[PDB]
Amino acid sequence: ELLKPRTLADLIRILHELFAGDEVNVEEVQAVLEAYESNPAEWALYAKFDQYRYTRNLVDQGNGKFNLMILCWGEGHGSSIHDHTDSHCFLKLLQGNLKETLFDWPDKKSNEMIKKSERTLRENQCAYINDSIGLHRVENVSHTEPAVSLHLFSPPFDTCHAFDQRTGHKNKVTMTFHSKFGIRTP
Ligand SMILES: N[C@@H](CCS)C(=O)O
Ligand SMILES: [Fe+3]
């Protein structure tokens, strides 16, 4: 029985219940993430920006079943085209807007990766992707508003691939945490 998370802390408790088992009910997880109404005071601790690129700020380690983190996107900051390492990715906007562009998995032959679609994710909306669906790029295209998003990955992963839009060629990337539990981790 899914209830509305009253706060970020409550959300986290509910997520621990939803991931108590070995599988993931994706529609339920998405519904509870969507139902949490972003309250900036609750997540200010985690919203640590960098001038030059987006940051990844760990909020909860999910008892090993998932990682919950907050990503902070300066104006004009965005990601590569990337996969999610055979894991679930849920993304909820906490502040601002992000452009999500979807791409198919490339064929072996070198070719421009043509965007399949795009959407603008607005405050409080939750998107979902996994590798069976495809690849995406996430970008804060705003010139005036920083963006903040809440990401849940299950199982946790710290490596993925970035894809060259000109060719489809992939490279392995190791991701890093800007902070963990509110603490900057150089
Ligand atoms: N997976 C990317 C963010 C977009 S989902 C990351 O963890 O930095
Ligand atoms: Fe992603």
Residue 169 in marked binding region: no
Asked if residue 175 has its Cβ within 6 Å of ligand 1, the reply is yes
Look up residue 90 and give its two tokens.
Answer: 């849920």
CA of 1 relative to ligand 1 center, distance in Å: 29
Task: Give me the helix-helix angle, 8-18 and 26-35, nearest 10°.
Answer: 170
List C-alpha distances in Å: 168 to 9, 75, 105, 153, 161.
40, 26, 8, 24, 11
Residue 161 in marked binding region: no
Report the structure determination method: X-ray
Closest Cα to atom 4 of ligand 1? 138
Q: Tell me the ligand closest to 78's alpha carbon.
A: 1
Checking 176-179 for CB contacts under 8 A at 24+ apart, the result is 176/56, 177/56, 177/57, 177/58, 177/69, 178/48, 178/50, 178/55, 178/56, 178/57, 178/72, 179/46, 179/48, 179/55, 179/57, 179/58
């679609």: which residue's tokens?
117
Residues 80, 100 contacting (CB under 8 angstroms): no
**What is the C-alpha to C-alpha distance for residues 59 and 1, in angstroms, rounded to an integer?**
24
Residue 82 in marked binding region: yes
Reported structure resolution in angstroms: 1.4
With the most atoms of ligand 1 within 8 angstroms of its CB, the residue from 50, 82, 177 to mutate is: 82
The CATH architecture annotation of domain 1-186 reads: Sandwich (2.60)
Buried b (16+ CB within 10 A) or exposed e, 43-65: beebbbbeeeebbbbbbbebeeb
**What is the C-alpha to C-alpha distance for residues 140 and 55, in angstroms, rounded to an integer?**
12
Phi-psi map region of 14: left, alpha, beta (phi>0 left; psi -120 to 50 alpha): alpha
Q: Tell me the ligand closest to 91's alpha carbon.
A: 1
CA of 145 relative to ligand 1 center, distance in Å: 20
| 136 half-sphere exposure, CB direction, 13 A CA radius | 24
Look up residue 29 and give its two tokens.
Answer: 């997880």
**What is the C-alpha to C-alpha distance for residues 171 and 163, in angstroms, rounded to an integer?**
7
The minimum-distance atom of ligand 1 relative to the CA of 151 is 5
Residues 48, 107 contacting (CB under 8 angstroms): no
Longest pairwise C-alpha distance within the chain: 49
